Amino acid sequence: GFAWWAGNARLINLSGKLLGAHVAHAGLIVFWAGAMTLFELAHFIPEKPMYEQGLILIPHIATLGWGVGPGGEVVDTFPFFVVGVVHLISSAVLGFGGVYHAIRGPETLEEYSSFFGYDWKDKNKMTTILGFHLIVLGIGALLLVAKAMFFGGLYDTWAPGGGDVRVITNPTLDPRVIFGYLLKSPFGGEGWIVSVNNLEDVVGGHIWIGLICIAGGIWHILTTPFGWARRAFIWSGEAYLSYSLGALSMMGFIATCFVWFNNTVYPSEFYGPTGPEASQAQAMTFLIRDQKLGANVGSAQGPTGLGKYLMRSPTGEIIFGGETMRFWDFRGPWLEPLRGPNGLDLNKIKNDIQPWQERRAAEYMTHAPLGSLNSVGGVATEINSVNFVSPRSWLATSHFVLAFFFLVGHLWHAGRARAAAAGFEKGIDRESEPVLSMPSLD
Amino acid sequence: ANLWERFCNWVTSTDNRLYVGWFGVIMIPTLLAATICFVIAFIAAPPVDIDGIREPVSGSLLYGNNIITGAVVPSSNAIGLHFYPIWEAASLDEWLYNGGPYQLIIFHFLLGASCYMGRQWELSYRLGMRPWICVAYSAPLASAFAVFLIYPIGQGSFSDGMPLGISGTFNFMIVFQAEHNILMHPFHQLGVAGVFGGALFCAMHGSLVTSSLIRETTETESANYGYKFGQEEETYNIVAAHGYFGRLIFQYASFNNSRSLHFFLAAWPVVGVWFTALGISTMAFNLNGFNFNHSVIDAKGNVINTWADIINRANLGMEVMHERNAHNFPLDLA
Amino acid sequence: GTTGERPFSDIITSVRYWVIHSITIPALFIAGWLFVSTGLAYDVFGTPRPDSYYAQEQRSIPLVTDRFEAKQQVETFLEQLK
Amino acid sequence: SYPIFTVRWVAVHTLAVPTIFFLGAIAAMQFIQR
Amino acid sequence: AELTPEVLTVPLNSEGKTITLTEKQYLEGKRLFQYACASCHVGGITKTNPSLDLRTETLALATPPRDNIEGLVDYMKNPTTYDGEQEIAEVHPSLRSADIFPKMRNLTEKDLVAIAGHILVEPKILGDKWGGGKVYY
Amino acid sequence: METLKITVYIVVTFFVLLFVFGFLSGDPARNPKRKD
Amino acid sequence: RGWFDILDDWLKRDRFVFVGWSGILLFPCAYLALGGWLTGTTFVTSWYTHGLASSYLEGCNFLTVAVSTPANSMGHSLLLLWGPEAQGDFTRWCQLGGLWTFIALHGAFGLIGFMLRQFEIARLVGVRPYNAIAFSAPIAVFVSVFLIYPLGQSSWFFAPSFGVAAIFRFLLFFQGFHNWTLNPFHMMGVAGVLGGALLCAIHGATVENTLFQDGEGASTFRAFNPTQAEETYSMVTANRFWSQIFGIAFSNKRWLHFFMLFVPVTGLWMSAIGVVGLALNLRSYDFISQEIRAAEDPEFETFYTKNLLLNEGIRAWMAPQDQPHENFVFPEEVLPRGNAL
Ligand code: CLA
Ligand code: CLA
Ligand code: CLA
Ligand code: CLA
Ligand code: CLA
Ligand code: HEC
Ligand SMILES: CC1=C(/C=C/C(C)=C/C=C/C(C)=C/C=C/C=C(C)/C=C/C=C(C)/C=C/C2=C(C)CCCC2(C)C)C(C)(C)CCC1
Ligand SMILES: CC1=C(/C=C/C(C)=C/C=C/C(C)=C/C=C/C=C(C)/C=C/C=C(C)/C=C/C2=C(C)CCCC2(C)C)C(C)(C)CCC1
Ligand SMILES: CC1=C(/C=C/C(C)=C/C=C/C(C)=C/C=C/C=C(C)/C=C/C=C(C)/C=C/C2=C(C)CCCC2(C)C)C(C)(C)CCC1
Ligand SMILES: CCCCCCCCCCCCCCCCCC(=O)O
Ligand SMILES: [Cl-]
């Protein structure tokens, strides 16, 4: 009894047409991944940093070690083409199965086959489908491990000499390290799992997750939910959707912070510098300029009494001064050579800054992730000239919006699933209004 | 008869004057902590070094503020996004100087308000209501997350979160405009349409229902006494209201279905405020309002100013003066 | 329910409607196009053309500064471009 | 029968006629160069 | 006002020879300046060293004088400090350092003249705005 | 300060456990129509 | 039947767009106000009054076009087409700012016409005139901002210009020059507008989530009938919910809907009063006690003093270009600026 604007709710109990909707939609996702990659490649100019060109998919491929060499220079565009073509081609297969199952195939699957058919309220069948998909997911996490360890490695921004593709031979297996990330505070200087800063931990985490997902998949194929879980959940397709919307919302907010703060699995070479990074790079830049002119940057007192170039963090570490004092948790391969045990090392600053560090700071300061909606780069008062919005801002903002709306959708569908399960989603029975049979509050 | 199940029955009782519920078990302590700390800080907290430059800003009444100027001041820029509970300070004196109370208040408040939203779902379920009032409240709730949590996360510091005070609020608005040109951002423009439109439709609906009240009283008594709580009959004539409003404009621009009408009332401001909350939340990552600065130039290349360049002059005056001691380098990159 | 005018949906799906308006709509569009492409819009409203905001060696705005001589000031400024 | 020309007809054309004209003029403007 | 040949006439060298650019060259120069330079030099300033701008009077006092096509084209090949005492190709884009500044790789000699001409023409159009910074926005 | 830290940890743990166990205690059944 | 009564008959016929006697004032004035704005934003410059481009023809977009105010030198001239300034020359009239007064004055009489239409239709249909009364708030805002405010100032130049960005500039002007955010009358306006939007949202949501099940569909809109006498949602359950969630709730539907009229209308009326004060520069600009302390005690700092520095920046940095008739020349060295920026 749904209206046209809620028309996809008419599929809740049509397993065959619903399968087609899902598979056709999957074709749309893979189609966009292929079409967008080819569009990005058609526009790609190798002499410009990726992040001056509005690219978000080529950076993901480069990060896996395809197409790039030392320093992130693009050496071969063919892997990008391949990725895009194969996705694009694959979307026709998914589109074909999708429209066949949506339009021509059995409307319900329960009759054609007891294996593919399902009842939302069949807790055994639901956990079995979940188990299969967990196994698939586990395999997917192990593919990343396979790439990193046996098929060319990954791009490592921390590699000595400017960054490079590196095979991961000793992934981190120590669960104190792997699960230690899951227990770190999400606040500053800690950063929960967003602080992962080396590829050994990245790959070992995916070994763990792959194994965990396969084990849990096997578990759910073989079990039925225990009574305590039976009594805690709503068992209906809309309820299950609502659970997944909540999970996607959570994941999207996490992805947002990943791309905004992490410069390891989102190398700044490809994505541009992070906000903290660019701010630090400004202070580095003027420290360099002023020191070259003769300034003693360690002893220069600024207007407030705090150091103009250098000051202490609240726990004593020597850090950049000015407003970037807030960003002293930043860590990046161009800056760490200057760090000693007590923070920034005055003797390294005076003696060991290299031209490539000067260049990188100047580049990152002038490519900070600030810009207008019409892609005028810089602070809001800047004049037109530079066409630039950082890929990090594009990826952060988009995924914040999506994550927010999916939380709304979680609330919408979770509340509706509860009300429909108890039988009052269409309104209050005039003849049995609960409040009319309750005592008054006063 | 079991202790836990009796506790469970009291927690979820529909007979409590104020509903508690499981969300209430978290909401009540966190709102009380935020409220008590807020009241005490507003009255008596000493000055706070908001921008981390050893330049403390007095926010409380006893230190020379009135109701309009007073604020609980954001925590120090020196802290940034670091977690600063009391037990991390060497002393309360230190915690107060560095703006500790702000953190305690906003974290307890955001948790408590979140649970307030869940509590709205929860009682609707206990009462056999439909469930989505809580979805309406997600619009103001999202807006508070934006200014107290998301914007600091994006800019790297709780010192750039919204101060808990009347003039502090205006300070936050002005700085935001200089750094993000929020007025030229479509999501804020949608917020204005949501809020202006919400006020419009509030007045419209109130005046149309009020215009069509059925005569049930005399000139010597308030017409409100013509309605009795829980009566079954509607108290106004919606067909007369529609007959007036459809002629004021034209027939098909007026609702005759009260359900669609009240759904529209709900949806317009909620959706507008979602957008404006998303505006703040995405300007948190410096995707700023439209920049048409020097977009119009003449045949020779002279800039021809538009009203956008005049906005820019105002934005510049805000930019160059804000936090006038806090910048040592030429770009205010966060 | 109705005041006797002809329903819109009946009109805009009608053959006669589109016989007339397939002419009148493009005609109006083209008229407005020509109003601009001929330069007439500039002259009617007094709007400067891209070459007519400033004189060649001029970065002063031709701002009207008198109420009752305003008409003549504008005219003086325009002749400084001929 | 239905009348052709009404007050409604006038109100509609009072707005539609200049709208299309303005739209054509604003279209032409997109090709103006300095 | 318009882009006349008078405005498009700039000094070619320190000896007073002049060259008249076409409108095409000027617009090419502008586009290329945006491609390769504006990230630091938007509006004629220098974001990473604001003490040094692209105003003609500043360039005139550079050693080698840079207020002419030749001086600017050379600067793009082999940049020096303002007093000419040190070569700074390793920290400033130039053809000499196109290995480390890749945007310089596909610049032709003609592109260099166009960029140099844009830098010399723009203060003739914009006045104090060119190189003056936010005060003049 | 450590006494304070411990107290808050304990108070928070306590309330959070009330919340988790309360919603695990057959919450779907606590409505006025169908209880299953 | 006299001629007047036959014209009454015709004016008051039930048709797709009701006309009425009020229509004779409303329809020409509204269409002229609207046509003037579209005409000016498409074709007309602000070069000679403001030194600004302001039309699509000139390269502006929907956000930056405006019909701008006349030059300050016009004072409060009506700027009639046939008046002494334009002398019947339409072109010069456009260039001098005549379309601004044209829109504002036709707009004002159109607003009167519209409120008269609300009265007229309400009398014909037999309802009470509260929608007309509510509309007094938009009227008060219009006259106070577009008419009274510039009349207390030097000229129409300082009224709002009719455009998106131009209004944005107006907001910012009011901050920097009038400290308008500090004004308790604006604050009451903010509360009535934000309070109205809250009431709108919370009332619509409440109704939609206290509906009676009056049909079997999952789309609950179908189970309403405009002639049913029964309430379509439960006031009783609504009241219980809000009483238990918030502590208090409405119990009287009439009071509820009057309150919805009251809150935003009152708020708008309050803001209009504050703007009447600003017509005279009668601002709530300062707190004297704060200034006395801060002048004497250089360590005393509040969010109030921080915001005045921002205002000072706004004024010095925007005035020369925003008020070109003043010929302000502020050398670099006199501009207020913090460190580095
Ligand atoms: C990803 C988006 C998506 C997907 C995949 C679906 C899928 C589906 N919808 Mg939903 N729907 C959507 C969006 C979507 N919808 C939106 C946005 C709306 C709002 C308007 C609706 C409103 C809606 C309603 C009101 C209803 C559905 C229904 C259905 C189902 C039957 C439709 C049918 O027989 O049409 C028949 C249509 C055609 C025969 C026309 C052609 C359609 C084909 C598939 C176009 C394919 C083009 C493509 C280029 C082909 C490539 C081929 C190549 C791979 C070989 C189907 C599973 C129906 C349902 O549940 O049935 C019980 C139903 O009543 N939908
Ligand atoms: C998860 C998605 C999914 C699911 C659950 C189903 C389920 C079903 N389909 Mg549909 N189908 C799908 C996708 C899906 N299909 C796609 C993508 C296509 C297009 C190729 C089709 C085309 C299709 C047709 C034409 C027909 C069905 C039929 C059926 C039924 C019986 C299938 C059978 O006996 O195969 C048994 C098992 C096999 C044949 C083994 C296949 C092994 C696969 C191909 C390997 C895994 C692929 C891998 C993940 C991709 C690798 C990535 C690569 C891009 C590099 C069943 C209800 C039939 C039906 O409903 O009859 C009424 C029928 O006639 N399907
Ligand atoms: C998509 C993934 C997925 C999904 C949807 C499910 C779903 C389910 N699982 Mg399975 N499970 C999975 C993956 C998944 N599982 C994997 C990979 C494993 C292997 C480890 C298992 C192992 C497993 C076991 C051993 C059991 C289940 C059970 C269940 C059921 C109850 C779950 C429940 O109450 O959770 C709600 C969660 C809780 C009540 C406890 C919360 C604990 C977390 C860690 C607290 C953290 C909260 C914090 C705010 C978030 C930050 C994370 C932090 C660690 C950093 C449900 C059908 C139960 C069942 O009935 O089995 C038949 C059961 O006993 N699952
Ligand atoms: C995995 C994601 C997912 C899935 C599968 C569903 C599935 C469903 N939803 Mg849920 N929903 C979701 C996410 C999801 N939703 C989110 C994230 C939200 C919050 C925004 C909601 C909010 C929501 C509401 C409010 C309702 C549903 C309803 C429904 C049912 C019918 C929906 C329908 O026919 O739409 C048909 C599709 C349309 C009418 C098209 C909508 C077009 C959108 C709003 C605009 C998109 C434009 C985009 C931003 C880009 C434009 C840019 C530029 C061109 C300007 C169906 C069971 C309905 C329900 O309860 O049924 C049980 C219902 O009333 N959904
Ligand atoms: C409801 C209709 C209406 C109203 C209220 C207005 C109101 C106004 N218009 Mg608008 N106008 C309208 C319709 C209207 N207009 C129409 C339909 C058009 C298109 C033609 C215009 C076009 C228009 C323009 C172009 C301008 C105005 C202007 C004005 C303003 C000045 C009017 C004035 O001074 O009148 C003076 C006249 C009267 C008040 C008439 C009084 C009637 C007298 C008493 C009778 C005379 C007796 C007779 C001469 C004796 C006969 C003897 C015989 C034998 C010789 C005012 C805001 C001006 C403006 O906006 O300024 C910025 C302006 O320039 N109007
Ligand atoms: C930052 C990464 C820059 C980019 C990109 C470009 N320039 Fe630059 N320029 C930059 C700095 C830090 C300096 C000062 C160098 C010094 O220490 O003296 C300069 C200087 C110039 C100059 C000289 C200005 C003067 O003498 O007054 C010129 C003419 C100049 N830069 C030109 C120029 C061109 C043409 C560029 C694009 C090819 C370009 N710069 C890019 C920083 C940066
Ligand atoms: C159901 C439904 C629906 C949906 C649908 C869908 C969603 C579909 C999908 C589909 C799809 C998803 C499709 C796809 C397709 C694809 C294709 C068909 C492809 C092709 C390819 C090609 C041909 C290639 C080529 C190439 C190459 C190879 C190389 C490079 C170059 C180029 C690119 C050229 C709708 C809503 C509408 C409606 C209702 C129903
Ligand atoms: C890969 C990687 C890694 C790793 C990771 C991992 C290992 C993770 C894990 C993760 C996990 C392990 C997670 C978990 C999660 C969980 C959650 C998320 C849950 C939730 C829950 C809930 C939701 C509940 C609810 C409820 C309640 C509370 C009561 C009753 C009712 C219910 C049930 C509803 C690292 C970092 C090293 C690095 C990089 C990469
Ligand atoms: C002033 C004047 C006058 C008058 C005039 C007039 C009256 C005019 C009118 C005019 C007009 C009357 C105009 C119109 C125009 C229109 C337009 C220009 C439109 C546009 C639109 C659009 C662009 C839209 C779009 C869209 C969107 C965006 C979304 C949705 C869809 C749509 C499509 C709607 C006279 C003569 C008396 C004289 C004096 C002066
Ligand atoms: C109340 C309704 C008022 C209607 C006003 C319509 C006005 C149309 C008048 C247009 C005529 C302009 C003629 C200008 C001649 C001026 C000569 C002079 O200034 O000495
Ligand atoms: Cl700084």
Numbering used by the authors:
A (entry chain C): 32 to 473
B (entry chain A): 11 to 344
C (entry chain E): 3 to 84
D (entry chain F): 12 to 45
E (entry chain V): 1 to 137
F (entry chain I): 1 to 36
G (entry chain D): 12 to 352
Can you provide the manuscript's text about this entry?
Light-driven oxidation of water to molecular oxygen is catalyzed by the oxygen-evolving complex (OEC) in Photosystem II (PS II). This multi-electron, multi-proton catalysis requires the transport of two water molecules to and four protons from the OEC. The OEC consists of a heteronuclear Mn4CaO5 cluster, which cycles through five intermediate S-states (S0 to S4) that correspond to the abstraction of four successive electrons from the OEC via a redox-active tyrosine residue (Yz). During one cycle of the catalytic reaction, the OEC consumes two water molecules; one is introduced into the cycle during the S2 → S3 transition and the second during the S3 → S0 transition.
A high-resolution 1.89 Å structure obtained by averaging all the S states and refining the data of various time points during the S2 to S3 transition has provided better visualization of the potential pathways for substrate water insertion and proton release. A high-resolution dataset was generated by merging more than one hundred thousand high-quality diffraction images collected at RT from PS II crystals in various illumination states and a structure was refined to a resolution of 1.89 Å. In this high-resolution structure, the waters in the O1 channel have higher B-factor values than waters within the O4 and Cl1 channels. The average B-factor values for the waters up to approximately 15 Å from the OEC in the O1 channel, O4 channel, and the Cl1 channel are around 38, 31, and 27 Å2 respectively. The waters with a high B-factor in the O1 channel are distributed through the entire channel, starting from the bulk waters (lumen side) to the waters close to the OEC. On the other hand, the waters within the Cl1 have high B-factor values only near the bulk at the lumen side (~33 Å2 on average). Furthermore, several Fo-Fc (difference density map) peaks in the high-resolution dataset likely imply partial occupancy of highly mobile waters in the channels. In the O1 channel, the Fo-Fc peaks are distributed through the entire channel, starting from the bulk waters (lumen side) to the waters close to O1 of the OEC. By contrast, the Fo-Fc peaks in the Cl1 and O4 channels appear only near the bulk water on the lumen side. The combined 1.89 Å high-resolution structure of PS II in this study helped model partially occupied waters in the crystal structures of the individual timepoint data.
